[PDB]
């Protein structure tokens, strides 16, 4: 498989598998890695989602998600604790906003259409703790079927 992890909104009922690489077979697997070399808990992690017809798929609902909500990520060894601290709308050409960081931060990307747009929706995240995933924290933040 290509999953690499999960990542969780509990404010906006975001709750999907991460992929590695974006690319037209992942579209509407879940959530997908932006560079080869972003790392969890460590500089800037970018992943695009899609806006479907349906808002409450894949990245949908992040266009309702406020500062400071948190986003939980996990590569099923830590837990990364990130907290809202922007969102915003930019044209598709501004790839500024995925390149890493010093910080360390998650970024969020959608389209802010279902339809076909050049104008995308992105919410930044600060990280805010890290710790080891437990089968307890695995099970509140990133819970089942």
């Given at each position: 498989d290509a999953v690499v992890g999960s990542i969780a909104v509990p404010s906006v009922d975001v709750n999907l598998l991460v992929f590695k690489g974006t690319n037209t077979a992942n579209l509407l697997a879940g959530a997908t890695t932006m560079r080869s070399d972003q790392v969890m808990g460590k500089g800037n992690y970018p992943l695009a989602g899609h806006h479907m017809?349906?808002?409450?798929?894949?990245?949908?609902?992040?266009?309702?998600?406020?500062?400071?909500d948190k986003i939980y990520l996990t590569d099923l060894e830590n837990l990364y604790e990130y907290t809202v601290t922007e969102t915003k709308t930019i044209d598709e050409?501004?790839?500024?906003?995925?390149d890493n960081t010093k910080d360390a931060r998650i970024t969020l990307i959608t389209c802010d259409?279902?339809?076909?747009?050049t104008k995308r929706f992105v919410a930044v995240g600060e990280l805010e703790k890290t710790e080891k995933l437990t089968k307890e924290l695995e099970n509140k933040y990133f819970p089942s079927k």
């Open positions: 017809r349906d808002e409450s798929m894949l990245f949908g609902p992040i266009m309702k998600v406020k500062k400071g050409t501004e790839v500024s906003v995925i259409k279902p339809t076909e747009t």
